[PDB]
Amino acid sequence: GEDGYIADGDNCTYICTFNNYCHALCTDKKGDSGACDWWVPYGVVCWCEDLPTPVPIRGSGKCR
Whether 8 and 60 have beta carbons less than 8 Å apart is answered as no
Resolution (A): 2.2
DSSP one-letter string for 6-44: BB-TTS-B-B-S-HHHHHHHHHHTT-SEEEEEEEETTEE
Half-sphere exposure of 41 (CA within 13 A, CB side): 9
The structural domains of the chain, with segments of one domain joined by +, span 1-64
Q: Structure solved using which method?
A: X-ray
Alpha-carbon distance of 54 to 18, in angstroms, equals 25
User: What whole-number distance in Å separates Cα of residue 10 and Cα of residue 32?
Assistant: 23
Alpha-carbon span 53 to 42, nearest angstrom: 21
Distance (Å, rounded) from C-alpha 12 to C-alpha 58?
A: 6
Name the helix (H) or strand (E) containing 46: strand 43-51
CATH superfamily of 1-64: Knottin, scorpion toxin-like (3.30.30.10)
Contact partners, residue 60, CB within 8 Å, separation at least 6: none
Residues in the chain: 64
